[PDB]
Amino acid sequence: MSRRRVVITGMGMLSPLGLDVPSSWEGILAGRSGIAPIEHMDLSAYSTRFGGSVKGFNVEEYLSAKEARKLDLFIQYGLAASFQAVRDSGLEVTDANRERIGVSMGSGIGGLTNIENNCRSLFEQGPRRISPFFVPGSIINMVSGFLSIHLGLQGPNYALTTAATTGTHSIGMAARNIAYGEADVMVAGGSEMAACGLGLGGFGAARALSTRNDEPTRASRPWDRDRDGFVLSDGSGALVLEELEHARARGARIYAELVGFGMSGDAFHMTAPPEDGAGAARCMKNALRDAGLDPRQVDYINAHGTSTPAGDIAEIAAVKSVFGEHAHALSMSSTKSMTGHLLGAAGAVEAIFSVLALRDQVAPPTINLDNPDEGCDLDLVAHEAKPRKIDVALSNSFGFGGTNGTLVFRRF
Amino acid sequence: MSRRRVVITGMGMLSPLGLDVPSSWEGILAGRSGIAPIEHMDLSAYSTRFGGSVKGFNVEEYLSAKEARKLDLFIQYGLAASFQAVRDSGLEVTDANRERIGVSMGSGIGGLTNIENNCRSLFEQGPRRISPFFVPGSIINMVSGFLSIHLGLQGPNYALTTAATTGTHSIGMAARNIAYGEADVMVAGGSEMAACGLGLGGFGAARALSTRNDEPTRASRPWDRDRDGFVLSDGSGALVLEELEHARARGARIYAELVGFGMSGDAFHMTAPPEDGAGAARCMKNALRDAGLDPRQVDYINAHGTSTPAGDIAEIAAVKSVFGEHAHALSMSSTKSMTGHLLGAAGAVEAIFSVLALRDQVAPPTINLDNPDEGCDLDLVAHEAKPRKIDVALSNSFGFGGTNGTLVFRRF
Ligand SMILES: COc1ccc(OCC(=O)Nc2c(C)n(C)n(-c3ccccc3)c2=O)cc1
Numbered sequence: 001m002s003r004r005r006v007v008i009t010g011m012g013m014l015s016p017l018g019l020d021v022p023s024s025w026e027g028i029l030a031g032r033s034g035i036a037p038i039e040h041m042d043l044s045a046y047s048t049r050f051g052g053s054v055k056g057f058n059v060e061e062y063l064s065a066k067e068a069r070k071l072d073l074f075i076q077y078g079l080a081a082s083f084q085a086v087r088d089s090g091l092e093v094t095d096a097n098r099e100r101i102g103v104s105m106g107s108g109i110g111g112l113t114n115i116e117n118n119c120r121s122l123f124e125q126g127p128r129r130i131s132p133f134f135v136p137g138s139i140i141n142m143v144s145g146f147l148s149i150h151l152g153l154q155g156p157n158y159a160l161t162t163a164a165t166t167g168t169h170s171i172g173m174a175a176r177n178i179a180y181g182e183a184d185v186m187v188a189g190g191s192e193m194a195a196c197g198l199g200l201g202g203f204g205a206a207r208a209l210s211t212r213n214d215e216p217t218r219a220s221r222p223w224d225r226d227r228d229g230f231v232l233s234d235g236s237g238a239l240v241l242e243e244l245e246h247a248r249a250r251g252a253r254i255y256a257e258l259v260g261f262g263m264s265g266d267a268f269h270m271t272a273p274p275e276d277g278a279g280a281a282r283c284m285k286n287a288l289r290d291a292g293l294d295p296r297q298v299d300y301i302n303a304h305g306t307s308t309p310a311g312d313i314a315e316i317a318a319v320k321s322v323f324g325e326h327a328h329a330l331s332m333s334s335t336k337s338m339t340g341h342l343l344g345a346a347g348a349v350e351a352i353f354s355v356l357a358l359r360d361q362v363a364p365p366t367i368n369l370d371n372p373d374e375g376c377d378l379d380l381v382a383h384e385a386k387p388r389k390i391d392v393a394l395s396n397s398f399g400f401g402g403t404n405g406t407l408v409f410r411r412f
Numbered sequence: 413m414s415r416r417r418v419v420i421t422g423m424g425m426l427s428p429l430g431l432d433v434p435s436s437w438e439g440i441l442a443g444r445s446g447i448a449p450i451e452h453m454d455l456s457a458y459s460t461r462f463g464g465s466v467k468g469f470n471v472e473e474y475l476s477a478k479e480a481r482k483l484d485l486f487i488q489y490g491l492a493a494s495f496q497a498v499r500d501s502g503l504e505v506t507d508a509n510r511e512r513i514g515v516s517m518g519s520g521i522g523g524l525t526n527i528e529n530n531c532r533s534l535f536e537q538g539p540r541r542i543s544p545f546f547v548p549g550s551i552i553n554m555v556s557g558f559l560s561i562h563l564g565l566q567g568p569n570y571a572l573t574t575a576a577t578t579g580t581h582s583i584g585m586a587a588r589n590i591a592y593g594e595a596d597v598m599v600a601g602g603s604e605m606a607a608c609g610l611g612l613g614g615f616g617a618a619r620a621l622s623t624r625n626d627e628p629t630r631a632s633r634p635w636d637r638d639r640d641g642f643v644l645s646d647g648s649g650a651l652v653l654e655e656l657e658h659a660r661a662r663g664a665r666i667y668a669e670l671v672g673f674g675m676s677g678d679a680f681h682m683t684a685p686p687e688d689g690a691g692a693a694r695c696m697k698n699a700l701r702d703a704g705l706d707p708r709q710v711d712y713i714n715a716h717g718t719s720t721p722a723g724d725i726a727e728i729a730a731v732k733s734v735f736g737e738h739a740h741a742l743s744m745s746s747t748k749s750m751t752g753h754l755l756g757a758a759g760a761v762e763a764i765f766s767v768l769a770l771r772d773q774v775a776p777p778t779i780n781l782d783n784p785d786e787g788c789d790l791d792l793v794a795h796e797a798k799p800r801k802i803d804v805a806l807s808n809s810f811g812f813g814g815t816n817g818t819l820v821f822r823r824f
C-alpha cells in the first residue's frame with residue numbers, strides 16, 4: 001500500500017525518425033515514415049530489402065572513437081539514448097547518491113552484427129582474428145555496464161531480454177526497484193540493431209517480415225487488410241525514472257508519472273498469439289489494477305501494432321475485452337506504422353511517445369491504415385495526429401514466447 | 413516490512429558433474445572434476461582445448477524429438493533443469509493458480525552455437541538455408557517462453573542476461589516477485605552452452621581462459637598462486653521458489669528459505685574488478701541487510717571464485733571488509749574448482765549447492781588449492797568437503813560490466 005511514486009524526469013532516443021526525442025516526435029506528429037531501402041549491405045538474395053535505419057549517427061558525440069570501436073552498434077545506440085536521458089534529467093551524480101542510481105537497459109538480440117562479423121573472421125582465417133573486445137562489446141548487459149562506468153552509477157545494474165517486450169519490462173522493473181526502495185533513480189529502456197544478414201534472414205526464413213520492396217514507406221500497415229508482417233527497425237529508448245520526493249526536492253522537471261506495470265504469459269505458442277488476445281487482456285488488467293485505475297480512465301493506448309495478420313486482430317480483441325464500450329471512446333495507435341518494429345527497443349521508444357502524448361495532448365497517428373480489417377472499428381487515429389484530452393496513456397508490448405508487458409502513465 | 417516469505421520447494425540441474433541434482437552434488441562432495449578435453453569439435457587452432465561439458469544428455473527425456481530440434485542446446489538445458497525442478501516441487505498447475513506461476517530463466521550468451529551454425533549456412537549458401545526456427549529457437553527468453561507453454565504458466569514471464577551474474581539475479585528477482593505479491597510460485601535460474609568456436613575463441617582472444625591443456629582437471633584453481641583464468645563450462649540450474657504459506661498449505665517439502673537478495677555495480681571497468689572488491693562488499697552488505705542478518709550469522713559462502721588473478725583476490729578483500737574477524741570463522745569455497753565457470757548458469761547451480769550445504773550440513777571443497785596466494789588465508793575448504801554447522805549460506809556472482817549479485821539462504 002505504501003510504496004513510493006515514480007515519475008519520468010528525462011528521456012532520450014535514436015530512431016528511424018531522428019537522432020533525439022524532439023526530432024523523432026516531430027516525425028511522428030507529422031505522419032513521417034522512417035522506412036527505406038537498407039543502404040549499408042547488399043540484400044540481392046533476401047526477400048526483404050528495407051527497414052528503419054538510424055541515419056547520420058555520430059557516436060563521437062557521446063564517446064571517444066577509442067571507446068566506441070570496442071562496442072557493437074546496439075551498445076552505442078543504448079549509450080546515446082541513456083546519455084541523452086541523463087542530460088535531459090539534469091541529475092547530478094555524487095558520492096551521496098551514486099549507490100541509489102541504477103541502470104536497466106535491455107536488448108532482444110544484442111550484438112548480432114558483431115557476432116556475424118566475427119564469424120566471418122573465424123571461418124575465413126581461424127580464431128586468431130577474433131577481437132579481444134568481442135565478448136564485452138557484444139553481450140546485452142554491457143549498455144548497463146558501460147553507462148554505470150561512464151557516470152559512476154553503483155545502484156542495481158541489470159539487463160532484461162524479453163524479445164519485443166524488452167523495453168517495456170526494463171522500464172517496469174526499474175520502476176518497481178524505485179517504488180520498493182532499492183534505488184531512487186533508474187536509467188531504463190532498450191536498444192537494438194539487428195539489421196544484418198542473420199536478422200533479416202532470420203525473420204525472413206520464419207516468413208514474418210513485410211516483403212513490400214516496391215513501397216517501403218507503405219509496408220508497415222497495422223490493422224490494414226493488406227498487411228503482410230512487420231518491418232525491422234533499429235534504435236534505442238531510455239527514460240530516467242525517479243522517486244517523486246527525490247525529483248521535487250531537487251526541482252526536477254517531471255514529464256509524467258509511471259503509475260502501473262503489468263506482465264503476463266499467453267502460454268499458447270512460441271510466436272503466434274491467441275486469437276482472442278487473452279494474455280494481452282490479463283496483462284492490461286494487471287497494469288490498470290497496479291495503477292488503481294478503472295479501464296474507463298484510459299484516454300490513449302500506444303499499441304504493439306506490429307503489422308502482422310494474427311497480432312493486430314488479437315490486440316483489438318484484447319482491448320475490446322478489457323475496455324468494453326469504452327473501447328470506442330479512447331484512441332489507440334501504432335507508431336510502428338512510422339517507426340517500424342524496433343524489437344527490444346520498441347517498448348522504450350513507445351514509452352516515450354506515450355509520455356509525449358500526455359505532454360502535448362495529442363494522439364499520434366496510425367499511418368497506412370487505408371482499409372481497416374474486419375473488427376478494426378476502434379478509433380485507430382488513421383492517417384493524422386488527433387489533438388485530444390489525454391490524462392492516462394497505456395503502452396503495450398507482446399513478444400515471442402508469449403511474454404506480455406503493459407505500462408500505465410498519468411499526467412502528473 | 414510486511415512482505416511475504418520465499419522458500420525453495422524444488423531444484424533441478426545439468427552440470428559437468430551430472431544430469432541431475434543428486435549426481436552433481438555427489439561429484440561435488442567427492443571433490444570430482446567435470447573438466448575434460450572437448451569431444452564435440454576440432455580445437456587444433458585454439459589456445460584452450462578443454463572445458464566442462466554436459467555428458468550423455470538425452471533431450472528426449474524431457475521433450476519430443478520434434479520439439480527439441482527447434483531449440484538451441486542452451487534452451488534444451490534450461491528446459492531440462494526447469495522440468496526437473498517443477499517435478500521435484502510436486503506442484504500441480506491448475507486454472508485456479510496458473511496466473512500465479514511465473515518463470516525467470518536467463519542466459520549470458522544464449523544461442524551462440526545456433527548463431528554460428530546458421531552463419532556457416534549464410535556465408536556458404538546465402539540466406540535461404542537459415543532455419544525458420546532460428547530466431548525463436550536461439551533467443552534468451554525462449555527458456556521462459558517454452559516452459560510457460562509446456563506447463564501452462566501464465567504469471568510473470570521474463571529473462572535476465574547479466575553475464576556471470578545471470579543465475580543469481582534471475583533467482584533474486586523471482587523471489588522479489590513472490591515477496592511483493594505478483595506471483596506465488598516462480599521457476600528461476602539460468603542456462604548456458606557457449607562451447608563453440610565463438611565462445612572459446614571469444615574468451616581466448618581476451619586471454620581470460622586457463623590454457624592448462626596438459627592437466628584439464630587442475631586448470632580451475634581458485635585462490636591458487638598458479639591460477640591462470642577460468643574454465644568454460646555448460647549447463648543449467650533451476651529452482652522452484654514459492655510463498656511460504658502456499659508451500660505449507662499444500663504440504664510441500666521445503667529445502668530452505670531465501671531471506672536475502674542484493675545487487676550493486678562496481679562502476680569500475682568492463683571486465684576487471686576493483687582490487688578491494690568494493691562493489692562485491694556493498695552487494696553482500698545489501699543482501700545481509702535485506703535478510704535482516706548480521707555478518708556474524710553467515711556460516712558458508714559459495715564464492716564466485718573463477719580462478720582469475722584479480723577476481724579471486726578481490727573476493728577475499730570484499731569478504732574481509734564485510735565480515736572482519738568473522739572472516740576466519742566461516743567457510744568459503746569455490747565449486748568452480750570442480751564445475752568450471754557455467755557463465756549465466758553459474759549462480760543457478762551455485763544457488764543449489766548452497767541450499768544442499770544447508771540440507772547436508774557440509775561445506776563443499778575448493779579442489780586444486782595447492783598453494784593459496786598472498787592474502788588467501790581464510791577457511792577456503794581446500795581439497796575435501798568439511799562437515800560443519802551451517803544455518804546461513806551466501807552465494808556470490810560478479811560479472812562483466814561490474815554487475816554484482818548475492819543470495820542469502822537460511823535453514824527453515
Ligand atoms: C495482442 O496480441 C498480440 C499482438 C501482437 C503480437 O506480436 C508479437 C511480436 O512482436 N512478436 C515479436 C516479433 C514479431 N519480433 C520480431 N520479436 C522479437 C523481438 C526481439 C528479439 C526477438 C524477437 C517479437 O517478440 C503478439 C500478441
Ligand SMILES: COc1ccc(OCC(=O)Nc2c(C)n(C)n(-c3ccccc3)c2=O)cc1
Pocket residue numbers: 135139520521574575576577615620642684685689692716717718722723724726727728730753755756810811812
Ligand atoms: C570480488 O571481485 C570479483 C571476483 C571475480 C569476478 O569475476 C567476474 C566474472 O565472472 N566475469 C565474467 C567472466 C570471467 N565471464 C566469462 N563472464 C560472462 C558470463 C556470461 C556471458 C558473458 C560473460 C563474466 O561475467 C569479478 C569480481
